[model samples]
Target: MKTLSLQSRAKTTALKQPKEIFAFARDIDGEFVYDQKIVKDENVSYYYLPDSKIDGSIDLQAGYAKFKKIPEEKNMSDMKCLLTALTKYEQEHNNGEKVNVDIITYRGLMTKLLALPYNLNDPVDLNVLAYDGQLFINSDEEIELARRKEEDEHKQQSMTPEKYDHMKRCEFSGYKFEAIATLPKPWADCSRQQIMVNNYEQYISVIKTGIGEAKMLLAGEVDCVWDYIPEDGKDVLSHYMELKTTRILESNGQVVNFEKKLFKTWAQCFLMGIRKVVYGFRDDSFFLRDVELYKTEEIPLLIKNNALGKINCTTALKWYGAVIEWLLQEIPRDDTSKAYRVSFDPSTRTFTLRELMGNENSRLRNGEMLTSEFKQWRESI
Candidate 1:
């Protein structure tokens, strides 16, 4: 019998892999010197310019003044300064010949560092060297590959059957849903069915006609739901939830650098009543795991404080609310001939909308007109 393939059919969330470390510098003999080492430091330490037997060295007299202007919390600025110094040194020594250098920041270095051993007693050592104007670490290719394979296997084993079913459904719906290991507890606690029902109610309440409401309600589908029963007297929490992920880099007790990604989505489900949002990133895990959560009421201040990212959560929520408001206050439509049809093509990843006459065959009408219909559709809710 043929062996079954181990690859996952659903989209696999691969752990970020580490790359090799390399440093090249010119020596005193005008020969290029290259050095590499695998990181042995469990802490993933940073290194200043390595010591190299360069025929000449640039004077720090001017560079020191430049460094003073840089904020102490910015490691990248320090790296830039060193690059500038190296450039000037090359210009002065090699008669304007450029000296190219690749400097990795502490976070970047850490990503390249070996992951913590699975077994604490696995006898691991990272080789770190800071010498000859060269900071170097050799990455163990075999060790890195083994770790990645192990992580992939672990991820496969950790998935629940229910989650696997949900992921498969998401895939069928033209969305890739990966099971995140660290999604927030309150949101994750909700079952898939509850999320679908809640989101459906929010959507159907806006449709102007009974047919519209019924159609929309039936169309809404999901695999998760929030199941929170309110206490005797506490105010109900807002339905909206915002997510933000951030990474802060620090050295010597100060924040030296930072990176962040923020997102907003249906709190407990995948389907959106209006158009499905196209986020800057494709991963729902971006919002599900290791993210700071905020309620809808706090968004205005959050935006004012610059706590959110480019999504403009307040504006989006308002616009969606406005759309619903327009639909709700509108008079019921008796003309069955006028109807709009929207569809998504998974192969092309494109969404299309067209006007249709709801006749026997539901034949397509001429002219791609929807702006006026959308305006009227959203006029009252």
Candidate 2:
């Protein structure tokens, strides 16, 4: 469940902002895990993270977990607001409009930045610290030096020994995620960066594998992250595909046996269709690798014959910004659309998004004010 905002392979080099970045470390039980001796920045405050995972007892979809007193948002409320607002601001600001994107965006930005009290999930206070510039393994030589300590057996366990022993060796300096995310696509034939996006239309909920978990680097600095589905699981792409944004479909519909047929059909309708699509898109892909976002001088739709090449399919992002933009359009903007809500139910101290944004109401009203107040309180620490 490690989450990061790496957009391209070179994002750290490209979009790495000068702003104060936050980091979190979790213990074996997914609790707050930090080390004072190895603190990255002393100016920024950090807190103990006990029980970082959301409590599923209430309702997997509805019940909110208290991350630190503040509600553990389905998406970090601040992140959600930040990404959506900042993106809109960039689009509109570039259009030469000044409608106070900063002011509105600032509200949430400040709250998270401050780490106010009501916003504090746990009563414990984290010492403010600075950014610990992470060490990056740029070349094969550097990568080898970083992992030279391991024995032959352990070395074989993982490609990068540092990530192999991140838990014990690093003392949980950061959380570690073990899954099939994206590694720099290695296929030389289609070795290039590309951005792909998937449609989440038929689905209402987005099952995020990782979001708030602090990102810790393991191998070559991740340029971008993309999702990879085995050749056998291609249907996941169709479920994620934007309905109208069709390019081509590749399904044989061949059944191996009775069980295989049932398995394939069930997989398509339930897990593949009903489930949220899992994939990744690297922003750097827009420039790096041969993958093209648009047909232009930079990326000319790498073609060989009349058809597009393998898209370097293994490492290439299948969809791009087009999908996210489409999902945004699905949200109702007017009265017929559902209004955002926030509520603080003291019984469980769970702030439910459903109640808070259940009806048409002002943004950051009474209950929502608690969010701000809580942030102010934490920041004061």
Candidate 3:
């Protein structure tokens, strides 16, 4: 008899298969990158860039800046708790002196950094990089493949899904639900879901709906629009930051003295530093997520490839779907099989999915867990 195909339909809350794991987990020239996209414009624009600043600043603040900190002691949101800590630290250490700019810069960077590598669908991406002498755990090809797959999946879903017939290409409806992993960033430090929910509600309450321009950036091959730059220098846009951190470059303390030989010294340092860091952080992982929003125009370049395709839609879409399926499998399972479900609501134009572990209580499927942080953020507001 012919051998049965290993591929099988997954149930809600089931553990994904090896192929699924491999699908989202990819390999490239030593650089692994996870991919995802947000329809920055449309109805849910407020979830990303705020329409107007209550404070009259260009920075759009909404997600986690309003929540309480770790709930064991403090009952307020983390951002609020952070403020309290800063105030107390200033009172005790500064003796009434003004807050340190560097400290604030660092704190601000840390706050945003905490939210960096912004991904609602895949938090695993946050902790997914590891490396050894020959192979880097963190440097798996999954990252890159994941990106390609997600774009492909979304584009395909948009064109073929039985549900999106009435929705315009630009129009989208919010995912009736979201996976647990896509919760808002504010909940990152929060262990419990209730606290995350409370703060999340507050986020939605204050968010306004309106049209806002999304800036696109194109550096080399990057093509997509995400965030904006300020009149000042070297500031990460508060709206969106698409960063990639992998163990691809080979070297220890890879430093380059550009002035001496341009990129020669830099390239040497880059290679050496990467190798050394890979070895050093073998057990102790290094988390690096940076902002790709410096150039808004670039986002469209990356995004267009996913949406516009000739044969089916876009090559990127096919790869992206494969990657999401892969990610749903990699996470530890709490169910009968490795399974997951993903969907894109063309009305709100948001994508949603989750693993099919039996324990997941999401409205969609068994493993499909709703992102408590994101749900709560909307509810709280």
Best by lDDT: 1
Q: Tell me the tens digit of each residue's lDDT in model 3 across 103-209.
A: 11111111111221222233222111111100001111233357657876796766756334423211111111011112233334334652221211111101101
lDDT score, residue 326, model 1? 26
The candidate 3 region of ten consecutive residues with least summed lDDT is 17-26
Error of 1 at 263 (Å): 4.5
| Backbone clash numbers for all candidates listed | 28, 48, 111
Give the per-residue Cα lDDT of candidate 1 at 47: 15
The TM-score leader among the candidates is 1
Order of candidates by TM-score, top first? 1, 2, 3
| Candidate 3 root-mean-square deviation in Å | 24.5
Higher-lDDT candidate of 2 and 3: 3
lDDT of 2 at 84: 32
TM-score of 1: 0.24
Q: What TM-score, over all chains together, does every model reach?
A: 0.24, 0.20, 0.17
**Each candidate's lDDT (Cα)?**
0.25, 0.21, 0.23
TM-score of 2: 0.20
Model 3 compared with the native: what TM-score?
0.17
